């Protein structure tokens, strides 16, 4: 009564506010439910192999167009699978790959001294990663011949380079310390460098 | 009530449930009575994107208006099922249901718990169903029967001149069918969508028409006589499925490996052209190859170096179409080859429509697959014509299925009305009351027709009912001067089984609507 | 001051759902909107047809006097506007000119329809009257032709005909563009059984104005020759649809080495193989090569040793068009071609055409399935305007190849039709005589615009033209920029028109009219 | 028309019709349950946390928070009816809404409402003459008015309240200044005395006032009292023209102070002299009452005297006591005689809670009396006040004329039958409205069937077929539903009641049904 008369006249009490927030949130919640079916035919590339449970009609215009774009995508992605073995170049050439390493290609510049299970396990993880991402340039070597008399208490130091610009750093075991460190966590860190797009729990 | 448990629970009591259902149905019937009949209004339904479709079809009318009511949702669902089954007079369904509920409202306005009305409606439905079984007349299908059936049932969803041209085209259409096989289905006949010219140019094609033209500027634009090679063999390049690569020491080794790569397409092409020449190619004996897979430019050039006809990527049903049009046996591999697989076409040419280039095959000796071409001013008119021809072919199928045609244009339902009135003092009780209104139920059908025509309702109605009562025949409704006059003599009928299913569904949905007692929005707590 | 809305249809709408019903809401609103749209662009497509410009969302400028582009870029919220613009687009797909005629005629017919529904006729009566008048017009129209098209081959006839389509642009110069278009089209038309509009392309150059444009039987490419040697007088042209590089495996062509001599002759054998291939291709007898794909530096080196011209293109359309033009052939292999499959040109010159590098093809044979038009101007909008005029002329020519029937210009035909259809509709029974007569009277809207643009008084000259049409003249129409009532003949001045364009225009216009008048209710959903 | 003012509600013909129909349906359906001695009992809550128990229609209309055009018209019309007659006002809205519902079924059938309007006016006229011819006279006696009061008291309240109030009202109308001239109840007041049982309300001869001795040192019960009715200032007054006192010593202060209370004391000495002249000793009662106030000085001066004084009473109190005690009201003391005095037999005081009361009874010939309502609950007090008002209204509408008509559906069904038989005379589709108009009165008994618990059509047809050769004066029973003659129990109702009922209902229905368009203009953007 009196409060709503106040409301017509004044705004001294606030009580009619904030009832639009949950309204808009629920609107968007109902809206975002059509994204599952919007791209049902626009994601899978095996739907042709999924005959008799995916076909209702074929317009042969946008769907053959989908095959065309899909095959272009496939050829573009499989023309780049050239790697998969971490390689040991020498320090003499080092200037030629710190700089002349290709523009638009990430370089995981790994430096290490073999012998500690830290460096050994890190080398194992990156070598196994090479089996998954053959589109990434891996480099392994002895830092002593890469950097003269490099402090041996600063290994293994991960370097992320492209066009001579350091984008990501992971210096020493201070960020990799522990035998509990695993495959997916390394992949997670290199994804966080901005090179890879994947998903992990933690 | 449960609203105590769920503060976000919307509850509508039994009386409230009936009230809201009735309001929804009344709105639906008021907007739908504008549709059926050759005099029903034609509306604009436009989406937010601006997509415009102009229709007289109740179903597409339903699915492009803004609907909100769960009861209205169920109405649309059942009407859509009816349209799926036969697709004609769909408006009659919902109008009948709405007015049945209206009469039930008029009576429930005096207490009178509705289950008695439901059972009385069931009994009256049974009696009227037997009456319909009696009243229907049988005449075997022919030129006049089917042409008049199409001309009559077509105008429920489309105008007049289109109805006439469509009737002629569909008379020419259902003739490539078997004698006694009933080979008619949508899987077997195709419709062309091409925005080319006005409506006075639409026709039909016994043969087949494809939207794919020459892949290379050496092909043939027109073949006098062609032998057809439908094939389901991969001709484009493919990768070895174990991912094998090339390892060599010399560039000439790379050359030899390239030759090794090409040899397989080479010998497939060799086999195909060898069969072509062996059958014949000389002296204007065109050869056509039909594949649904890719073709390499290497294979394209290899086959086209001698000007063969071959194309790519047609609809998968076109392979059935061609088997029953050209006659040649289909194939999936060249393990076994014989000129038996060769099809035949009496004329092939091309005509490029705008950006798109079209091929046409025709002069089929025994065509079992035919296609329909329609050209109109724009998209909305072509969608409307496509829907109209779909429903018209549905009606033609329904007519040619059985050999019984019921008269149309309002006679049969007033006949049912009077017959049910006669039977009424035998229904044993207050259900007669419902039965009474139940007769008044069918009362709407010419009434709406009378309503659409602008004639005053009660006078024409009592005229019609008196005309039927005095005689025993079936008198129809005039749509030019309103004067009662029988309609079966000008070529007016309607599908018997269609009305059977109509009455079935209408009664079932009517009792389902009337038997509601509680409307909830349970959930979202 | 409290009142809700009616339960029922008004209460089952969506929140964003809007609706118009009956003669009141739907009919008056769409009729007024259509009249607005017709009046917006009712000042163009004439001898004085005043060009109008517009800015788009894409922030590109457009100065057009044919309604097609300006309406297609413009967006609306009125469905009937979508109907009329789609009608114009269908006209364009049929012929592609005079997009203002359909708009003016539609506006006039919708005005008359609103008047008739004010009178109180059934929609069916008016619609059927208009359809009767439509088919009667279809029947009487072919009886009105004069001086149909003879050959479509001579140059002067092409000038005289296409200039008529040209007056809609560039009022201050006519004959120059006529020469250009006539020469180009006579060069390009096979004159036997077929044609494609794609067979003609044009090229634009920034710089001097129209005074320096030209036509070349031979394409224009801006590309630059890789090799030093350029511009042989007349020579053979080898064309490789495949890339210029050597045979590369479409799979991985890896190499493995076990001993030293393999490496010792690795590059030696590579260079020898490409040397042999390039040597054979040179021994084919040509000196001109235009590849499709990228170019190999060492193969280019051998070409230097063999003195070969190299050009690489991007458009496969251009590649096939070259095959059509110079007799070139597509070879998807690096194998040397045969002399039958050879390209030929009397001039392939790499030159500068206004401080822009150009590769010009020219034949003394004057042959080729495509001939290019070099355009000269100072601003891109001028390019667009001249290209629109050129397109009007060339599509006039293309649609006139077939359907060589002609129609008088100057608007006399429309008034003849109006008078005749009114005379016929004077006898119509029922209540459709009003519709049939007003259909005819609607043919006064086109001369209304034709008189308002030229700066002359409209109704005076309209009355005079009716007076002289009472004498029965199909060829008397307004004098341009007269400023004083004066009319004369048009066939004298070549002021003419095509039959098929007008026929399609009127047919589509009537279809749209019946379409819109058959609409009885409008339902809109929630806006996107 | 949302263009001239973008914010304005514009509704077309059917929109206005539908909203009016829906509002009328809601109102009538709500008010079905509020008539008969077996109607449903309504509880209402005001905008403060205060509760009223009502069976009255106008109370319900003006307590509902309802903002609607038709509802506003209903509230105004029912307010006027309650003002004039004030009984069975439910019938008004029931008739109006039922006629609306009827005419809906035919306007929906394309009948333009004007024709139904002329049909309704013809039905008005014919039913008017029928009721005029079947109206029957009877001399107004005690038992006749007992039955008439029982009618309305069973109408608006329950049994025992009716049992006491019939007696109360019939005795109330007996007390009158002039039997042969119109009675008025402003001389017969109602006072609320909220401390006793619901059965303790009764009628008291004379008047009782709520204010007592403003200078309490007085007696407690006096007998054989003479009455002084004065309207003069008995308290100190300052002259309107401003002035002040001036002196120079305290002796002048004493003189002026003692001379400033001289005029009022002269007045009270006049009064005391008149008292002693009228009666000396022997303890004869002598009551003085002034409309205006009395200052404490003269208050004590007269309280030391045995005289009792009353001040600040209601303005109509004195005007009615003028007749009640037989005295003449005094407005100044310029002349005076004992004739202007009134008299009473016994006067006593009684205390309760915070207030006390002055009882004036044993009037020599009671021509003004007072009704006292004693009850626990204030809303109960108000409900009993409404009941007594309805009873007095009914007895007045009975006595004013000399004619009365049977109720409880009897004459209703009578004119129903008469109009059904007469309808063959009237012409046009308006005839149908007449039938609907007939159906109008049919709502009246059947709701009683709904208020009794019987099948509506069963009882309706029993009563309709009860018609012998002559028109039986047969209504509906309240315990068996079987047709029963009205005269046997003797429950009737006033003629002009149903007369103005028909007048108002017909005219308001015309106004509702002639409307064309609804606006909500007047919004300054």
Coordinates of N, CA and C in Angstrom, one line a residue, chain B residues 102 110 447 458, chain D residues 111 429 432 446:
Chain B
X102 N -17.3 -26.5 -28.0 CA -18.2 -25.4 -27.7 C -19.6 -25.9 -27.3
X110 N -25.0 -26.3 -17.8 CA -26.1 -26.7 -16.9 C -25.7 -27.9 -16.1
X447 N -22.0 -24.7 -42.9 CA -22.2 -23.4 -42.2 C -21.0 -22.5 -42.4
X458 N -28.6 -19.1 -41.2 CA -29.7 -19.9 -40.8 C -30.6 -20.2 -42.0
Chain D
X111 N -25.9 -12.7 -36.1 CA -27.0 -11.8 -35.9 C -26.5 -10.5 -35.3
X429 N -35.9 -12.3 -37.0 CA -34.9 -13.0 -36.1 C -35.0 -12.5 -34.7
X432 N -36.0 -14.9 -32.1 CA -35.0 -15.8 -31.4 C -34.6 -15.1 -30.1
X446 N -33.3 -22.0 -11.7 CA -32.4 -23.1 -11.8 C -31.2 -22.9 -10.9

